[PDB]
Design a protein around this ligand. Structure first.
Ligand code: Q9C
Ligand code: K
Ligand code: K
Ligand code: NA
Ligand code: ZN
Length: 640
């Protein structure tokens, strides 16, 4: 029921800074906050967010994660002169103090708690806090790496205590390891912590052995700590997406969190002097988007690091755009993760194979300065989704959905198309279908007016043929076709314009690398199996293919997962998807339009394990396709 995105920010947090020379700290500046808020204002994003005021964290709230001794020591820093502040600072690693920093740290922490309350009270769907100082390096009794108090740790502990949540996911995509968060939740199975980080075989700050992939948690928490070290610099969009599809997302959808918290550092973006990675600001639009089906969209993004003022602002915008449901940018030039990333990924998956169903097949032999382009403009569609129910059927639609109304120009175009390719066809309504299909496609393709749509149809073949051919000569260079059904469609995949995913009940072999045919055995297995295929096979290929339109097709004869797919597939083609439902089903159509319109997706519940037969079918698919579609790889390839 919740709507809106909270934006929590206050200028007071820009009113502390470094007072002496220190090259290790000089990158952390007040302008990080003002440049980011200014970019949100510039692009119209702040004005579309609910402004929630900041508050101080209380002393009892601070004590959730920190010791009285530490708190008492920090409480004294407002009274110190600069000499005393430098001497206090030097007791810790890579951190400076300022007379106002205790005050701002209490603000950064309270700002996060304000965000958790706004999302958990259903006052907003999700939100972001722009806070200084950052939090994820700080620990029970120490400030560390520009961090005073552990903002994100607070959020999880506050959410456990005040909302009795049993499963919280924390995604830390900052370029540094958040060891403070790891230490806090090491033994706690109710918080799943995932972090990637520049590591370089422990030679990169903070130089900890327990930042390696081997640290999986302790005791009852074993398996709920996931470290993915980057052992070279220059990681790219492909590396990041490979990490999500093959490590993070399989575990997250299996865990089924009730709240997602993001430790969102943008020192992992291109141009950052700390990360020296190569991922574009647009990738954070997808990182955000791919997590939003989780926890019914309850997602608290919390700013950590980020030190290239330009890439920080662009990356913050890409994130808020995604929180607001705006269409994702298309990611070009994706492919295999590099060898170093693949080594990290394969080591992580193997060490976590003891704890997670998505990796369990791995345990047994039988089983197995720089410049870059400014991001393009992301425009919410005037109306998001158009829907064409069968004639006579009116339905309750969200405020951002409309019914279609064939124009005379389109009616002639349908007449031409029947004149040429379909002579002996005169059914007046499976020809209104084609007028619907063509009219809804033109709104999707020819203007930012409409984003996506769904049409109910009767004859699959004529409908699919006209949709696909009208798409290709609009023109849209490539079209991803997703077909749940058992026939053979009028679809040609022998020219590179079309990739066909088919989820069917009859087992088939596909001959060529532009078709992916998944035959899952029906039963209580079906849902975990499908989600495994979606995350580990379908999304990897789709992202690399980079279609300009997605064509979804469902024959009259699964379902539980269809909203997750529809939501996730909108990362492709700027969300331009056309769904063709053969035969009227009230609730499938209602589910489709919900997810197409950007509404929250109901959770699946924690996932059981898929049938080993289904895993085998899927890995055979991977082996068959990963030479062509390298984003499928989650292992280093054999050298000649
Ligand atoms: C919030 C954040 O991203 N902090 C990064 C801390 C950087 C410390 N660098 C140490 C340099 C070693 N010579
Ligand atoms: K991290
Ligand atoms: K934990
Ligand atoms: Na120091
Ligand atoms: Zn960082």
């Amino acid at each position: 029921a919740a709507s809106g995105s909270a934006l929590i920010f206050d200028e007071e947090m820009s009113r502390y800074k470094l007072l002496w020379t220190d090259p290790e700290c000089e990158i952390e500046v007040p302008e990080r906050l003002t440049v980011s808020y200014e970019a949100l204002r510039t692009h119209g994003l702040a004005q579309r967010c609910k402004a929630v005021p900041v508050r101080q964290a209380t002393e009892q709230e601070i004590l959730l994660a920190h010791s009285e001794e530490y708190l008492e020591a920090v409480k004294q820093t407002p009274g110190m002169n600069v000499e005393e502040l430098m001497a206090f600072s030097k007791k810790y690693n890579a951190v400076y103090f300022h007379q106002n920093i205790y005050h701002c740290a209490k603000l950064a922490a309270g700002a996060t708690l304000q965000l958790v309350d706004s999302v958990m009270k259903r006052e907003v769907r999700n939100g972001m806090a722009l806070v200084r100082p950052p939090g994820h390096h700080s620990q029970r009794s120490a400030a560390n790496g520009f961090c005073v108090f552990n903002n994100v740790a607070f959020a999880a502990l506050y959410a456990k205590k005040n909302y009795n949540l049993n499963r919280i996911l924390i995604v830390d995509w900052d370029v540094h390891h958040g060891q403070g968060i790891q230490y806090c939740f090491e033994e706690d199975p109710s918080v799943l912590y995932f972090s990637w980080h520049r590591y370089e075989h422990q030679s990169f700050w903070p130089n900890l052995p327990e930042s390696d992939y081997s640290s999986v948690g302790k005791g009852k928490g074993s398996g709920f700590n996931i470290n993915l070290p980057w052992n070279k610099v220059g990681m790219t969009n492909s590396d990041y997406l490979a990490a999500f599809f093959h490590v993070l997302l399989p575990v997250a959808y299996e865990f089924d969190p009730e709240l997602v918290i993001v430790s969102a550092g943008f020192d992992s973006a291109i141009g950052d002097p700390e990360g020296e990675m190569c991922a574009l600001p647009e990738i954070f639009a997808h990182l955000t988007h791919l997590l939003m089906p989780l926890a019914a969209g309850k997602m608290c993004v919390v700013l950590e690091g980020g030190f290239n003022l330009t890439s920080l602002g662009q990356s913050v915008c890409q994130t808020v755009h995604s929180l607001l449901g705006d269409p994702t940018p298309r990611i070009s030039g994706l492919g295999t993760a590099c060898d170093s990333a693949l080594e990290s990924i394969q080591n992580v998956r193997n060490v976590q194979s003891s704890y997670w169903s998505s990796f369990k097949h791995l345990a047994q032999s039988e089983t197995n300065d720089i410049v870059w382009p400014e991001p393009l403009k992301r425009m919410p569609a005037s109306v998001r989704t158009v829907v064409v129910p069968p004639p006579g059927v009116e339905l309750t639609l969200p405020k951002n959905c409309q019914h279609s109304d064939i124009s005379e120009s389109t009616a002639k175009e349908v007449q031409r198309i029947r004149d040429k390719h379909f002579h002996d066809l005169t059914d007046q309504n499976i020809l209104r279908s084609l007028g619907n299909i063509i009219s809804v496609l033109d709104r999707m393709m020819r203007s930012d007016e409409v984003c996506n749509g769904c049409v109910v149809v009767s004859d699959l073949s004529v409908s699919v043929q006209c949709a696909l051919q009208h798409a290709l000569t609009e023109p849209a260079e490539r079209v991803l076709v997703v077909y749940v059904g058992d026939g053979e469609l009028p679809v040609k995949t022998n020219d590179g314009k079309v990739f066909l995913v088919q989820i069917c009940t009859k087992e088939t072999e596909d001959k060529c690398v532009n078709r992916l045919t998944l035959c899952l055995r029906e039963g209580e297995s079906l849902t975990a199996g499908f989600m495994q295929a979606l995350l580990g096979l379908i999304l990897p290929v789709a992202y690399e293919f980079n279609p300009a339109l997605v064509l979804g097709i469902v024959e009259e004869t699964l379902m539980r997962v269809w909203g997750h797919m529809t939501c996730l597939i909108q990362g492709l083609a700027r969300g331009r998807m056309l769904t063709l439902l053969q035969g009227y089903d009230k609730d499938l159509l209602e589910l489709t339009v919900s997810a197409l319109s950007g509404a929250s997706i109901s959770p699946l519940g924690p996932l059981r394990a898929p049938k080993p037969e289904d895993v085998e079918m899927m890995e055979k698919q991977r082996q068959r396709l990963q030479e062509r579609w390298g984003l499928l790889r989650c292992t280093v390839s054999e050298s000649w």
